[PDB]
Design a binder for this molecule. Structure first.
Ligand SMILES: [Ca+2]
Length: 279
């Protein structure tokens, strides 16, 4: 399949070189997988999701995304137009309020909640959890992500937006999950993106067009926007039979575009998520 004039990041994770705008992909498009977006929620009514999104939990007085963040990240995962894996099932878990603030212990709860709930869902092709959130370092927050991964969910986490070494941030530093740094449309590391030997992979993070609440779209930036590109890619790869939830971070690294980003500090992998479809 081909989707012309695509947001740059979808074209980028289907290309070897920057500077084009078509997204080349296999039409199975994540059918039969599932992705949990752990965030401010998902406006499931947004037609872009076409009936393929459900809130299934909240830790606040409402399950709605009243912030837009969770809706945008979810759109990059799996909206019809702006998503990677256009036919995956989406599940929302609202751990962030509407200003986009969550206490750790609520983030921990929602993470254990996925390890359990996946068992209430039909996801024959694999299950993925996309966490576009983080803060300082916590053994506990890290341990919750390592349980979610261990429970057979591919866990994708934002490396963080301070321009540092992500080894001081959580859940990013947790070593056993897949920590996602950011790039721009000219293959630069985004000027914020965190870096450090705990990163596994980069995906598109700077000027990412996706869904926003009210039915609407906006183009925002962050490792938060890079993270659901690599979650959706993993759903896409499960579904194709290439990899598995345990194995997907390694498979994505093995098949990445290798050398191609500017400003990988020393010591940070220079790897750019790639679907290997067109070549
Ligand atoms: Ca890893």
């Amino acid at each position: 399949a081909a989707q012309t004039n695509a947001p740059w990041g979808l074209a980028r994770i289907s290309s070897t070189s920057p500077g084009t705008s078509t997204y080349y992909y296999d039409e199975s498009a994540g059918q039969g997988s599932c992705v949990y977006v752990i965030d401010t929620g998902i406006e499931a009514s947004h037609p872009e999701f076409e009936g393929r999104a459900q809130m299934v939990k909240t830790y606040y007085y409402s399950s709605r995304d009243g912030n837009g963040h969770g809706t945008h990240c979810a759109g990059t995962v799996g909206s019809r137009t702006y998503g990677v894996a256009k036919k995956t099932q989406l599940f929302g878990v609202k751990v962030l309020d509407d200003n986009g603030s969550g206490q750790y212990s609520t983030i921990i709860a929602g993470m254990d909640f996925v390890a359990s709930d996946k068992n209430n869902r039909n996801c024959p092709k694999g299950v993925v959890a996309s966490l576009s959130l983080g803060g300082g370092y916590s053994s506990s927050v890290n341990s919750a992500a390592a349980r979610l991964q261990s429970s057979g969910v591919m866990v994708a986490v934002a490396a963080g937006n301070n321009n540092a070494d992500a080894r001081n941030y959580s859940p990013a530093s947790e070593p056993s999950v897949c920590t996602v740094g950011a790039s721009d449309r000219y293959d630069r590391r985004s000027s914020f993106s965190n870096y450090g030997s705990v990163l596994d992979i980069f995906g598109p993070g700077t000027d990412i067009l996706s869904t926003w609440i009210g039915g609407s779209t906006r183009s925002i930036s962050g490792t938060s926007m890079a993270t659901p590109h690599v979650a959706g890619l993993a759903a896409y790869l499960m579904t194709l039979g290439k990899t598995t939830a345990a194995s997907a971070c390694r498979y994505i690294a093995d098949t990445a575009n290798k050398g191609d980003l500017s400003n990988i500090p020393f010591g940070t992998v220079n790897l750019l998520a790639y679907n290997n479809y067109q070549a």
